[PDB]
């Protein structure tokens, strides 16, 4: 009477095989980030100590 616990749920190539009617068919493609931007904003030196 010991019950287990299991879910049990739910690179590339260099060749071709075409078809019986012409129509070539290639293998899968490899997998495919935003930016590197920056913004500088000056601080007037009367709101310095609050910062």
């Amino acid at each position: 009477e010991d019950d287990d616990d299991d879910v049990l749920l739910d690179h590339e190539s260099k060749t071709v095989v075409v078809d019986d009617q012409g129509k070539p068919r290639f293998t899968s493609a490899s997998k495919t980030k935003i930016k590197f931007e920056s913004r500088k904003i000056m601080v007037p030196p009367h709101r310095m100590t609050p910062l």
């Binding site: 590339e12 260099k14 060749t15 071709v16 075409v18 078809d19 009617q21 012409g22 129509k23 070539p24 068919r25 290639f26 293998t27 899968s28 493609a29 490899s30 495919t32």
Partner: protein
Amino acid sequence: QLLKIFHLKTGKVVRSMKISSPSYILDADSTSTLLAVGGTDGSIIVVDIENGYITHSFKGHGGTISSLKFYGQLNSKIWLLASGDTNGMVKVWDLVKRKCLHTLQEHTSAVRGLDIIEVPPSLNLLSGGRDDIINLWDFNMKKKCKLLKTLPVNQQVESC
């Protein structure tokens, strides 16, 4: 946002992909089942249209990408891609080995309108441009050379 509509009675959106750059040139093959699309950075994805997803990436290039063309005869083993450019160049890819065949830097504006055929692998190609030069090449499979230039006075778009 790339989409494809099967033109038959099932007019539903069959496949829908998220491509990288907003693209402005597409070409399908002379046969079916090959769709090439290149963005406005250097990336020319090609897609088998039946079970629609990416079959080649082709980072490869530079600048925004002008017109391009397939080389398709049914039941072949060649399957090249043409790949024009804005800064004037033509960088031919195949599709059976994912390699840059020949790098060609010779033009001066956007390489619109290029075409590939064979005459007895000979495979002569021809690449126009916004400059007035149509500039056909011999384009062997291993190592290529040049022939005549023959200079039309236009601004050639899709020199078929």
